Amino acid sequence: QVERFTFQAEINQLMSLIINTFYSNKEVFLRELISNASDALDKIRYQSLTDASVLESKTELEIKIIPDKTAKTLTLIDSGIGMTKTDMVKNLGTIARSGTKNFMEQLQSGAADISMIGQFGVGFYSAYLVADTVIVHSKNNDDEQYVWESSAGGEFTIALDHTEPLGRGTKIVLHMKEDQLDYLDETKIKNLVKKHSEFIQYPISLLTIKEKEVD
Numbered sequence: 001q002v003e004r005f006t007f008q009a010e011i012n013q014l015m016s017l018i019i020n021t022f023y024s025n026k027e028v029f030l031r032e033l034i035s036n037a038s039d040a041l042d043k044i045r046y047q048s049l050t051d052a053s054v055l056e057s058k059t060e061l062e063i064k065i066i067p068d069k070t071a072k073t074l075t076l077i078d079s080g081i082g083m084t085k086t087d088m089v090k091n092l093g094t095i096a097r098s099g100t101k102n103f104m105e106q107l108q109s110g111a112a113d114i115s116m117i118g119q120f121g122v123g124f125y126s127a128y129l130v131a132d133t134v135i136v137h138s139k140n141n142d143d144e145q146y147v148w149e150s151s152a153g154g155e156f157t158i159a160l161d162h163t164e165p166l167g168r169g170t171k172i173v174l175h176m177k178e179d180q181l182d183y184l185d186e187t188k189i190k191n192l193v194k195k196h197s198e199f200i201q202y203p204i205s206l207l208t209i210k211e212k213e214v215d
Contacts, residue, residue: 001159001160002157002158002159003157003158003159004155004156004157005089005093005155005156005157005158006093006154006155007093007150007154007155007156008093008094008095010095010100010101010104011093011094011095011122011125012152012154013104013108014104014107014117014122014125015125015128015152016152017107017108018114018125018126018128018129019128019152023113023114023129025114025115026129026130026180027192027196028114028115028117028126028129029126029127029129029130030183030192030193030196031118031123031196032117032118032123032124032126032127033076033123033124033126033127033172034063034076034193034196034197034200034204035118035123035200036123036124037063037076037078037080037170037202038063038078038200038201038202039080040078040080040081040082040169040170041061041062041063041078041079041080041081041202042080043080043081044061044079044080044081044082044168045061047081054141057139057141057167057168058079058166058167058168058169060079061079061080061202061203062078062079062202062203062204062205063076063077063078063197063200063202063203063204063205064076064077064078064204064205064207065077065189065193065204065205065206065207066207066209067183067184067185067186067189067206067207067208067209068184068209069181069184069209070209070211072175072176072181072184073173073174073175073176073184074130074131074173074174074176074183074184074189075171075172075173075174076171076172077166077169077170077171077172078169078170078202079166079167079168079169080168080169080170081140081141081168081169082138082139082140082141082166082168082169082170083136083138083140083146083170084140084142084143084146085143085144085146085158087138087140088136088138088146088148088158089158091121091124092124092136092148092150092156093156095122096121097120097121099120100120100121100122103119103120114126114129127172127174128152130174130176130177130180130183131174131175131176131177131180132151132175132176132177133149133150133151133174133175134149134150134151134172134173134174134175135147135148135149135172135173135175136148136149136170136171136172136173137161137163137166137170137171137172137173138166138169138170138171139161139165139166139167139168139169139170140168141168144160144161145160145161145165145166146158146159146160146161147159147160147161147163186208189206190206193206
């Protein structure tokens with residue numbers, strides 16, 4: 001079963017602005033997504049300080065990053081608190097803070113910059129600086145694994161996830177744009193992850209997939 005939702009008006013503007021207009025430091029997306037991953041890890045960790053049984057679904061607190069040149073995807077997986085179905089609609093389809101709604105006017109006027117999008121809990125959408133389509137798989141202890149998809153257009157979808165179980169956490173899949181495929185190159189992404197994760201307290205693994213014909 002697939003359930004359709006409309007983005008809240010501001011989110012469409014934020015997304016239109018991100019997609020339609022232009023920015024020069026697209027690499028901030030990685031910083032934002034790694035920061036979200038760390039936040040989620042912080043959340044489950046803080047829960048485990050009062051109740052260590054929350055960690056049972058997946059004991060490792062870590063981030064995994066997988067560039068796939070063949071699939072043209074960059075995937076980021078964290079074992080954070082994950083999102084329930086309601087959490088997904090809220091966190092990926094709405095703006096909560098009224099302060100964030102004002103910031104959208106300072107951003108749209110050009111006074112504010114894309115790189116500060118994270119200070120208002122919307123750094124996620126910076127993924128559309130490099131990806132035409134973004135898939136989010138998420139699993140929270142108090143609910144089932146759901147999968148969230150959007151390619152903008154004023155709408156997103158959510159379904160029960162039947163792909164590989166996460167145990168607990170969030171998997172974001174960016175279907176890269178053709179012009180932004182070098183983010184899947186080993187040296188590029190390694191240095192960018194190193195740069196944008198210096199203060200992150202969690203381990204971060206970078207996967208490299210090499211393919212050679214036998215001869």
